[PDB]
Every structure is written in structure tokens, then in C-alpha cells.
Ligand binder design. Structure first.
Ligand SMILES: Nc1ncnc2c1ncn2[C@@H]1O[C@H](COP(=O)(O)OP(=O)(O)CP(=O)(O)O)[C@@H](O)[C@H]1O
Ligand SMILES: Nc1ncnc2c1ncn2[C@@H]1O[C@H](COP(=O)(O)OP(=O)(O)CP(=O)(O)O)[C@@H](O)[C@H]1O
Lengths: 221, 235
């Protein structure tokens, strides 16, 4: 049943991603030859991914990671692409949310599990938007230093209490204050151990009035 | 130890069912997406039709995920319930008012239905969670409307006894087999239909009503109709 809670949570980003592209296609993009095949490709990939997700989360209930060498620039770019589409077909005024990308010009190659790591990126990107009720710009950086590849995601949202910067990675822990709104508290806990499974590190810095920055570090080579 | 056994076995089939039930819309989706990708997107007489179906399968899964989440919070005691003293007469009336309002707008209604109200005349004040309890009434009212003949009457009663507040909602449909009066509240139990409709509604409603300290059950005679009951402890 821990299966049920986890799969319910983790299916939310792909379903939202899937619906956004379907609505874009439905809104008229299906008539447009230079975008429709690309959009359809994303829906096909997200649908297949959700099926891969359902089966594996059920098997875990009975150290299963699929490591491949990946170009993080391209993947993170792909992940952000899905969120851009989400934001363009959302209920909010255009430019109410913005994803700013600041990637290094180098191509960074890292050993990760593509499906499991995507879940991590989805959770944090979801958080950055969801806890930015008054809108905001999300800043996503990608760089390598000291043999580590580092991803950072910054928001102009609500902050995180300094006392709770450690607790946000705990399972079912949610910040107990009021917003301008919250769910289970499973996102960052799940996200943390996937990063730890990949040999990485995750941490957060925040100012309670202006926003937060989450960090992921992965082994380079 | 058949106790812990039955607990562990109910859980295993539920989990299997959730795997199967989430897998099915996605597989349908995959087929439509491949048809579109294989070339149907270029075709104006099928592409819009296909896209709508994919949208519905997606929407249905979102309703499923949300319902699976309500059940998981309930299954863990994470659910936050707020018992407050409210006028049940007025609340039930508002629920019925909103359903009445829907039918009074002519989107060439699929099926015309009538709601007869038989409320007690004393005003009943009770501790409940209005938001969660309203959800239950909608679920039963939706069912009552969905499974009633064309021109049928839905009978909504509110009555009190020394120790119980009783709400009953009756439909004039084909009813429910005596063997399935308990089973209709089980998770994923739905009429044989092989889009929409999860079969989690009454399961959620049973656990919400039980959460509020109440009781829910159904009586039916095949061919004549069904009556659903909600009992809440009075004063
Ligand atoms: N950018 C941000 N700004 C402010 N608070 C944040 C934040 N990112 C996370 N948090 C807080 O830290 C906690 C992280 O827990 P987690 O994200 O697992 O809960 P959750 O899964 O219910 C969020 P969601 O419903 O969007 O998936 C949240 O309760 C949230 O309040
Ligand atoms: N008033 C009624 N009369 C006859 N059968 C009913 C009924 N209410 C429910 N049922 C049957 O019991 C099962 C459980 O109903 P429930 O309302 O939980 O399904 P659901 O969650 O998909 C909402 P809906 O069926 O209105 O879309 C359904 O499959 C339905 O066939």
C-alpha cells in the first residue's frame, strides 16, 4: 500500500505534462506540421514512462536502479521543456511564471537512472512553482566544479524556515505555516533517496520572504 | 491469525487492482497516440476525435489519482476532519438546490429527473465535517440520478429518531442484487462496463461516513429501485 501512496504522488507530474501537450495539440497545434510531431513524441514518451513507473513501484513492494551515461544538459533541458508547456497551458496569465535557464556551455555526462532522476527534477520544479503563489521566475543552473555536477533551482516564492531546512527532506514533513497550498510531504523525501541512490547529494538554502534554492550534486567522473 | 491474514490479503488485491486500473487507461492512451503519431494527426476527420479521447483518458486518470489519494490519507489517519455544529436541514437543502439548478438549465438534458423532498420540520443541529459530508451526498445523488429511469423520481428524506439522524435517498432504477449490497462500497466495484467512472466513490463515502462516526448501507429490490441510508449519532 506504500506503493499506492507513492504511485499516486509520482504520477502527478507526467499526467499534468501529458494533459498540457494534449491540450496544446487540441487547441490547434495538431494543424501545425512543425510542432505536432514533436508534441506527440513527448506524450508518447510520458505515457510509456508512467507505465514503466507503475510496474516498478509494484515490484519494489515485494536496490533496483538502471544506470546509464547521460548528457545532463539535454535531459534537464527536456525536463524544463515539459514544465514550460505546463506553464503555457496553465490557468495563469502568460509570463506569470518564467523558467530562466543558465546552463554551462560544456556538455556534462553523468551516471544516473533517467526515470528516477527525472522524478527528482519534477518534484523540485513542481515545488518551486507551487510555493510561488504570487508568481515568480524560476532559475535553473547547471555547472560542474570539483568533479561534481551541480544543479540549482531558485524561486521568488515563499521561503522555508531556517529551523526547517533540514526537516523538509523528512517523510510527511511539511512546513506548518499559511500560504497565499500543500499535500502529503512525500516529494522531497522520495527525491532525497533517489539522489542518494545515485551517489549524490541534495540540500537547500532559503530566505523566508523572498525564496529558496535547492541543490543537487552528482558524481562527474 | 486469519485476522492479520485477511488484512494482508485485502491489501494485496487492492494493490493489484490499483496496478491494473491505472494501467488500463494508459494502454488505451498509448494506442491512440501511436495512431496519431503513425499519421492520423495529418487527417482532419479523425485527429480531433482521437485527441479528445486521449484527453478524457488523461482526465479520468487524474480523477483516479485524486481519489486514490483521499483513500490513502484515510488509510493512514492523515485525513484532517473538522467536526462543527451545522444546520443539516439547510446543508442538505443546498446540496439538493445545486442539483436542481443544474437540471433547470436546458443543455438538452440527457435524462429528466425529479427530486422529492421529505424533511422533518424540526431543525437538526449536528457536529459534522461539512466539506467531507457534502462530498458523500453528491456521490449518492449522482448515483441516484445516473441510475434512475427517464422521468424517474429521486426521493430525498431527512428524519430523526431518538438516537439517530437519518438521511435516505431513493431511486426508481433496476436496483442492486441482494448479493452485492455490501460489495457496492468496495474499492473499484463498478457495474460491468468494459471515459469516466472509477468505482471508488462509494468506497470513499463509506470511509468518510465511518470517519464521522456514522453508518452507511443500501437496500434494494431488483426492478423497483434502491435506497441508500446514512445514519449519524444524534445529540
Ligand atoms: N520552493 C519552496 N518554497 C517554500 N517552501 C517549499 C519549497 N519547496 C518545498 N517547500 C516546503 O517543503 C516541503 C517539501 O515536502 P514535499 O514537497 O515532499 O511535500 P509535497 O509532496 O506534499 C509538495 P506537492 O503537493 O507540490 O507535491 C513542503 O511541505 C513545502 O511546504
Ligand atoms: N443508486 C444506485 N443504483 C444502482 N446501482 C448503483 C447505485 N449507486 C451505485 N451503484 C453501483 O455500485 C457501484 C459503486 O458506485 P460508485 O458511485 O462508487 O461508482 P463511481 O465511483 O464510478 C461514481 P459513478 O458510477 O456515478 O460514476 C457502481 O458500479 C454502480 O453500478
Amino acid at each position: 500500500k506504500q506503493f499506492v501512496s507513492n504511485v499516486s504522488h509520482e504520477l502527478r507530474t507526467p499526467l499534468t505534462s501529458l494533459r498540457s501537450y494534449i491540450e496544446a495539440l487540441s487547441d490547434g497545434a495538431w494543424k501545425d506540421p512543425e510542432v505536432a510531431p514533436g508534441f506527440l513524441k513527448v506524450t508518447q514518451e510520458e505515457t510509456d514512462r508512467m507505465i514503466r513507473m507503475i510496474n516498478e513501484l509494484l515490484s519494489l513492494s515485494r536496490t533496483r536502479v538502471d544506470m546509464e551515461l547521460v548528457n545532463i544538459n539535454e535531459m534537464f533541458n527536456y525536463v524544463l521543456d515539459r514544465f514550460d508547456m505546463i506553464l503555457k497551458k496553465d490557468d495563469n496569465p502568460a509570463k506569470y511564471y518564467t523558467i530562466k535557464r543558465e546552463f554551462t556551455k560544456r556538455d556534462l555526462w553523468v551516471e544516473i537512472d533517467t526515470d528516477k532522476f527525472t522524478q527528482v527534477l519534477d518534484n523540485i520544479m513542481n515545488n518551486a512553482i507551487k510555493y510561488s503563489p504570487d508568481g515568480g521566475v524560476v532559475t535553473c543552473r547547471l555547472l560542474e566544479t570539483h568533479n561534481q555536477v551541480i544543479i540549482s533551482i531558485s524561486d521568488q516564492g515563499l521561503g522555508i524556515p531556517r529551523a526547517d531546512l533540514g526537516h523538509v527532506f523528512d517523510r510527511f514533513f511539511r512546513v506548518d505555516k499559511a500560504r497565499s497550498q500543500g499535500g502529503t510531504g512525500l516529494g522531497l523525501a522520495i527525491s532525497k533517496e533517489v539522489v542518494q541512490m545515485l551517489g549524490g547529494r541534495i540540500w537547500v538554502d532559503s530566505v523566508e520572504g523572498k525564496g529558496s534554492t535547492f541543490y543537487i550534486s552528482l558524481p562527474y567522473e
